[PDB]
Amino acid sequence: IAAGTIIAGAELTIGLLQNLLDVLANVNRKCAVGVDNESGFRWQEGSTYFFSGTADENLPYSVSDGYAVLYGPRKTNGPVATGVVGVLAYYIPSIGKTLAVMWSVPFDYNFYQNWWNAKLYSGNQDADYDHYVDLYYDANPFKANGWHERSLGSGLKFCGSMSSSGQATLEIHVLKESETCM
Amino acid sequence: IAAGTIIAGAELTIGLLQNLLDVLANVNRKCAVGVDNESGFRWQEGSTYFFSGTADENLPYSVSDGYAVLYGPRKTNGPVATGVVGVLAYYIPSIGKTLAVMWSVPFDYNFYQNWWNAKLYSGNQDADYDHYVDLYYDANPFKANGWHERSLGSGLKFCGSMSSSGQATLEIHVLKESETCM
Amino acid sequence: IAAGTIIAGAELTIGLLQNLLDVLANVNRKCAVGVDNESGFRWQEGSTYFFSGTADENLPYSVSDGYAVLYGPRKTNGPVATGVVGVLAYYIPSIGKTLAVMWSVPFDYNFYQNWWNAKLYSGNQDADYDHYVDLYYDANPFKANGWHERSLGSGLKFCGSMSSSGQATLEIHVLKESETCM
Amino acid sequence: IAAGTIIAGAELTIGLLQNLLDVLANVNRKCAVGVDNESGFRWQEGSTYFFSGTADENLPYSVSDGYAVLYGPRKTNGPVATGVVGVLAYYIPSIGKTLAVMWSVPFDYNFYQNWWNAKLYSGNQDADYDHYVDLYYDANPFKANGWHERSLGSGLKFCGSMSSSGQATLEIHVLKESETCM
Amino acid sequence: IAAGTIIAGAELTIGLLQNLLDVLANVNRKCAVGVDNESGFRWQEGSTYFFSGTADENLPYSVSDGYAVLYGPRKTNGPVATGVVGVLAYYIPSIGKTLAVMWSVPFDYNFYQNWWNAKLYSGNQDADYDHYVDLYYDANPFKANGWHERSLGSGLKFCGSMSSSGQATLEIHVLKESETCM
Amino acid sequence: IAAGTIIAGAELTIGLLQNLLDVLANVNRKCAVGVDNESGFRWQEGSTYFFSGTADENLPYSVSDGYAVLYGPRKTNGPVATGVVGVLAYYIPSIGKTLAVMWSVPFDYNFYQNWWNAKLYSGNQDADYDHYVDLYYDANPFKANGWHERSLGSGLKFCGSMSSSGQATLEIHVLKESETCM
Amino acid sequence: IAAGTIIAGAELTIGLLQNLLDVLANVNRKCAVGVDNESGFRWQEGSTYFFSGTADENLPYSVSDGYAVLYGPRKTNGPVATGVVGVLAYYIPSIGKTLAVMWSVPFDYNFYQNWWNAKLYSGNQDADYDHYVDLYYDANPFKANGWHERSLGSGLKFCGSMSSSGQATLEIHVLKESETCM
Amino acid sequence: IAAGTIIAGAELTIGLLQNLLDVLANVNRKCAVGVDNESGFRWQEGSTYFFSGTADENLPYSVSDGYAVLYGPRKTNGPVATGVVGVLAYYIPSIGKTLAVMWSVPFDYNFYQNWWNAKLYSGNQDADYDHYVDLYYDANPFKANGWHERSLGSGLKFCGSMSSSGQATLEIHVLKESETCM
Numbered sequence A, B, C, D, E, F, G, H: 001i002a003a004g005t006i007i008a009g010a011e012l013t014i015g016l017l018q019n020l021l022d023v024l025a026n027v028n029r030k031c032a033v034g035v036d037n038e039s040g041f042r043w044q045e046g047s048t049y050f051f052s053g054t055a056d057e058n059l060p061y062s063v064s065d066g067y068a069v070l071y072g073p074r075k076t077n078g079p080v081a082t083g084v085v086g087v088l089a090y091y092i093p094s095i096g097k098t099l100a101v102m103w104s105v106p107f108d109y110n111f112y113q114n115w116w117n118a119k120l121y122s123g124n125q126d127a128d129y130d131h132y133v134d135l136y137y138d139a140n141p142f143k144a145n146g147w148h149e150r151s152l153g154s155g156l157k158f159c160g161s162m163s164s165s166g167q168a169t170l171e172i173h174v175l176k177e178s179e180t181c182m
């Protein structure tokens, strides 16, 4: 008798663990990031950092005046239980500064929410974790509750918005400070 | 013998809970919101608040004279048992007021029904919970029973309708007070 | 032994209740309502009432001379065991009266059959239950057995037909009293 | 022991009744009825009666000289075990008579076969059961064995055919008596 | 114990009978019959008889000089274990005779094979069983082994072929006796 | 106890026989036969014989100068365990001889291989078994190992090839003896 | 008791053998062979030999100056556990020699790897096993590691490459010795 | 009793091993490698080496001025638990050096990450393992964290990027040293 209830309990347990790992594998997170360059300067040397998740495509090397970044990052495949969270940065040699854009689309919406930010750092810098913790904690991010606007200095500003869901769209326009948004 | 009826009862229970969570995951709620700007003024600084549910796309930053918002919010993914309920708001600098539009598509139609409303608040204001409780309780909403019309002051009015189902369409035209609807 | 036949009887019972609720969910009722405005007057302020069922789309605000309502109502989703039954009404300010159109596509064809009607009430009135009980009991409805024709007064009449099935099509032409149907 | 063979016999019985009702639901009957108006007169006030089965579309109100009825009736949904059997009738005011067309596509081809007929009654009459029993028993119908032809009086005749299967096509041309068929 | 092996044997038996009736339902027989009218005479009053099987479409009333019959008959739906076997006949008033075409596509190819024939009978005659037994037994049919040719009298002949399989194609050209086939 | 292992062994046996007959039903054999008429003579009275397998389409009655036979034969449906093997023959009245083409695509490639042949017999002859045994045993066939060429007499030759698999393509060009192949 | 564990072990064994034969049936091998004729001579009398595997299409009889062989061979259907390995040969009468091309795409990549070769033999020769063992062992083949080049004598050379996988592409250009590859 | 729990444990074990090998078979790795030739020199004699994985297509023999390599390598089919890792190399006779490009897309991202590199070796050299260990360990590779740039000598440089995921895209532009990237 007794080994039959052990094998039956083993099949019940793998029935639970199969459904658990198939749920965590089918819970999806992504952020379609559009950054639109109305700045009047060429961006170059495009770099990216992921705290969580990844892209399949490359970021483009450069954005000319009036062109856009259109970049699609997504969470890791399989039952990973992490969101998509990262930095995108470009150097702007016409002003000697690097624009960094951050997004955060979490896995668990009880603990976290969608956040985004952008800032214009001094010099040429690669995108890395020190920009993520700054753009997420040391400077005020935005809640994904519609459109927001902020100055960058050097005659620049941005306006942008993010959708509040796990399939997110982030849209930013980087503009001259003297001009109307969108 | 006895552990075999415990594992059989465990599989019966997970058979119930699988069918329960698959029912709550496949019960769908959405509201296709169209707001049409026949106002003669440019709307800007678009903001949104969700009491329940979310959008995937962004709301557009601005609506010019004769253009429309076309915005699609939907309930949260998975077995959540909540509807889609929210506010949409734009600033109108030509009059110094913010138009806020509200919809409410509930999960459980025994307790609740489809409602919508719109109002024109003083000053520039972000969309938030204080507009939701006002547009839903402190001002009279509309029952989703065909077309309705109301004045906003400052030479504006709206007419609109909402469908009575869980896949809802809300349509609003915002107009000069002196002009015929649709 | 005995608890094994209780769990086997529980699985038999949920096998019955699953097939019952899947039958009631897949039994479908709808009425494609076409109302064609050959009246020579503009209709406006479109309203609708459901005794049973719902639409997904909005009814259009107004119908001009030579245009049509094309409106699709359907029963509630899931295992609800109710048909689609309702009123549609428009105000006609050129004569000071409201045209109301009624349809009734029942769930259970042993007790009920497809019925429709139309009438032209005095003044501006919203579509509601008092028009449903009138158009269904206090005035003679039509059996869905081919084409029928009736005068409305104020120089108007209608002709129309309804198909006899649970996927119904209702077609009405509203005409000048002095003119030939279709 | 004994309750286990009762639940096993209950599942065997619902396995039979599921396969029985799925067979009766998937056994399909329909009749694509074409009636072609080479009569030189306008037909109007189109009416229909079903002894068994139904249509989804409406019959058209009128047929002008050289136009056709193209009408699709079918058996009732689900495990109903009845065919499609009915009358179609139009008034012809140029002669003061009503053309009635009958078809009969049975469920059980051991007891029954495909039959059709047409006749030209005096006056304006609605399509009903008294025309069905007449067109099926009191006047000689046609066996669905190729093309047949018959005079109607008032200078009219018809020729037509019906296919011998449960997915039937009925084709009739109504003609001047002095002219060649098809 | 014993009733459990009776219910197990009942489920084994319905497992056999399900597979038997699904095999007999999916064994398909059809004959695409093309009869091409190079005769120089109009054919009319088209009739058909089935010993076994049926068509869904109608046979056309008439074939003019240079036109074709293209007619598709098939076995009865479900587990019927019968082939498709029939006669097609037209009257030819220019000579006072009726052309009859026969095909036979059997269910069981151990007992039977594909056969076809055609003959030109005196007078106007409906297609029926007396033509089937004549065209199949009292006159020599053709084996479905490529092209064959035969005179009909009255200045006519035919040439034709049939494919040897259960999805059959029969092709016949009816010609002036003085002219080359195909 | 004992009848339960008999019913379990019966279900095991029908599990084997189902998989056996589904394997023999899904093992497929066909030969796409192209015969290209560069002969300078019209071929006519096309005939065919199958030792094994069948076609669905008809062979064409005649091939004119520069036209092709394109003919598709295939094994019998269901679990038959036989290949496709046959003769195709046409009469050539310009020389008083009949061209016969043979192919053999076997079921079991341990015992057999793909073979083909062609020969030009005296007089008008129907395609039959005496041509099959001649073209397969009494004259040397070709192994399906690329292109081969042979004279026919009367100023004709052929060149052709066959693919070595169970989905076979046979291609033959029949040519004047004085001309280059393909 | 004991016969129940024998039938359970029989079903376990056929569960293994079903999965084994379905794995060996779905492991696929093919070689898309392109041979491009920049030689300045016409190739003719195309022949082929398979050590393992087969083609469905025919090899073309001849390749003119500037045309290509495009030939697709593949392993045998079902659970055969053999790769695709063969020779292709053409006669070149302008020089009195036959070009033979060899490929080898094995089943088991632990024992074997992709190999290919080509050589220009004296006289007209059919493709056979003596060319396979020569092109694979008696002359040095190429490893499928990118592009390779070799002289053939008579003023010819080739360059070619093969991909390293079980779905292989072989590309060869046959050229004048005095000219640049691809 | 006891053999029944052994066969039940055997089926549990093959249930685990089936799910294990189906997971390792459906975990996919690939690298879409684009190498863009803005060098002003023709590349030729294209070669490739795989440490792990394979391509289906061939690498092109040569790249002219302004053309691109577009090459798709992928991991081995089935449950192999290895990534895709390799070298691509071309000779550049205008400078007497060979460009080698390396990528590494690992299976297990706990131990490893995406890496790439490129270098310009002296002389004509085939792509092999000595270039892989050099490009991966003896020269500094790049982390797949956005765009990077490096000089090659002989008046050349490259810029490129790689995406950080298991479905990777590698993009490299090879340029004159005096010119701006992308």
Ligand SMILES: CC(C)CCC[C@@H](C)[C@H]1CC[C@H]2[C@@H]3CC=C4C[C@@H](O)CC[C@]4(C)[C@H]3CC[C@]12C
Binding pocket: H017, H020, H024, H079, H080, H081, H082
């Ligand atoms: C059958 C009994 C002994 C169970 C033992 C499990 C072992 C033998 C099975 C289970 C999983 C299998 C391994 C899982 C997959 C891989 C990784 C692959 O790159 C090589 C084969 C290899 C290494 C398999 C070899 C055999 C294996 C290790």
